[PDB]
Ligand binder design. Sequence first.
Ligand SMILES: O=C(O)[C@@H]1COc2ccccc2O1
Ligand SMILES: O=C(O)[C@@H]1COc2ccccc2O1
Lengths: 276, 289
Amino acid sequence: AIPAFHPGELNVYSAPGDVADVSRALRLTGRRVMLVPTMGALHEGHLALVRAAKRVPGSVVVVSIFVNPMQRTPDDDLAQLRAEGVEIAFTPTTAAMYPDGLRTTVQPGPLAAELEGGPRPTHFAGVLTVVLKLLQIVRPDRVFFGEKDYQQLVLIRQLVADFNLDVAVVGVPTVREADGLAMSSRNRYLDPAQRAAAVALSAALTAAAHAATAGAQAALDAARAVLDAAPGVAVDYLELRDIGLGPMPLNGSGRLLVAARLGTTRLLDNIAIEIG
Amino acid sequence: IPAFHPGELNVYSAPGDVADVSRALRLTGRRVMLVPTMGALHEGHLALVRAAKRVPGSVVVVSIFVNPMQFGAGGDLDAYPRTPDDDLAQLRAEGVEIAFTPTTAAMYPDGLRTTVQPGPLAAELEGGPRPTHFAGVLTVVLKLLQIVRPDRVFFGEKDYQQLVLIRQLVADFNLDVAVVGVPTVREADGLAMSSRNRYLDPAQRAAAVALSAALTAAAHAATAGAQAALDAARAVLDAAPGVAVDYLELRDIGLGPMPLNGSGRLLVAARLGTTRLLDNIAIEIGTFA
Ligand SMILES: O=C(O)[C@@H]1COc2ccccc2O1
Ligand SMILES: O=C(O)[C@@H]1COc2ccccc2O1
């Protein structure tokens, strides 16, 4: 007997089998199941993923909330989802998700060792493992991820292609504060000087995107100049790549990515670039 | 979907074609059974096909793919038996409606990129000297399950360690599929059927009976305990001319970090000339606990 689902309200499930049963039953009634994976502490960036998911006709929206140890405000997160008209939150325990410990896992391809995988060499294995599991639990038609974690998003699309997963991956543009700073729960840690200097990341990227009519080197030099004008911003990398994160082609579409440390806080940003 | 003629054998090579046809069958109430194989089919495989057939409303998909990722460099891959015509004739005879025969290029367009890493069980027994062997198997089995999306997936108990790791895969990645183990089919003398058996000359074929002899001896000696069971198996193997034992181990049924209780599985692997054979049996210790 299928678990109780109440249309038009927030239905919370902690058991994987429960969310699995409700989702399967909803899909057979002609709903299209959309998955939005989060680690809770929700902000506007998450709500933008929510809104994209909601505007697919016949959608029912699953927001998972789960702090993944291989890679929190409960009632607040839940009230945000309620206010967005999300119908399912999936809130499992670590024991429900990992009932036999870490045993079989996903091993990402070589891209997981670069860029973010430099300081965190096992981070992406953890993320791919947890995403693969959420996909199998919920079986969504579409899964939504923000572009702010661009390398993550690329790795997810490799997971999906490589394991023949039958789901559409949707990347949603970065939601920014008014001065351009990419939204992230880490932004709250920045003191005023840091918060003011942090704008250099988005400013450098957008400057590069416009300098790019003058080519790749102009674009990288424009970005570096802007980063160079900021105090207390330790750049770990600034790299132009193709959109799949291979080597930048002589012209065409690319992606410029940056990561930097302000005090103890690590920030990231990235932007589409068109060369020429 | 591409064409699907029922009551007949439909052969698809493109993952997209079998996935579409599979989905359509499932959207109209049939229950898709998957039997994954490396071809060179024999009666051990047909027992898997018959178990699948007997599931009501079933449509059976047999895949045939010699997966290069689970082989070690050094000739094993080029030496594997390929008999496609016989394979497909047997499936026709069994009333299988779907054969999935993908290309290496269709399965590995990006080479080895995203892959499955098994638990530590994959580093032991068969994986000890072949440490990437089970990553290859679990990767292709994951992909076949995502392409075909069966309700149930069938495997022989002969490759028992592989069956166990597959159940691990399925539990650990929350796959919505039931894994059915099917008992080993045996020659009249006891020899576990395997595509490898054709590689035994008549002498080796005569000697090979020692594996199953040792295991069933041990299963009956087991009333007297684990040591008696193991010593019986070992003595039988010691009396076999030309059998080189790789391992003989008694484990818990999960093969795992639990000590052996009253129910176990006894596993053997051995070389006759260059041919490596495996077999295993259920074992009940003492009372039969
Ligand atoms: O809370 C978030 O923004 C992150 C972003 O990406 C995620 C990927 C897998 C599982 C949860 C995830 O949530
Ligand atoms: O043909 C066989 O014996 C094997 C049986 O085990 C297999 C496991 C994964 C993929 C194919 C397989 O076929």
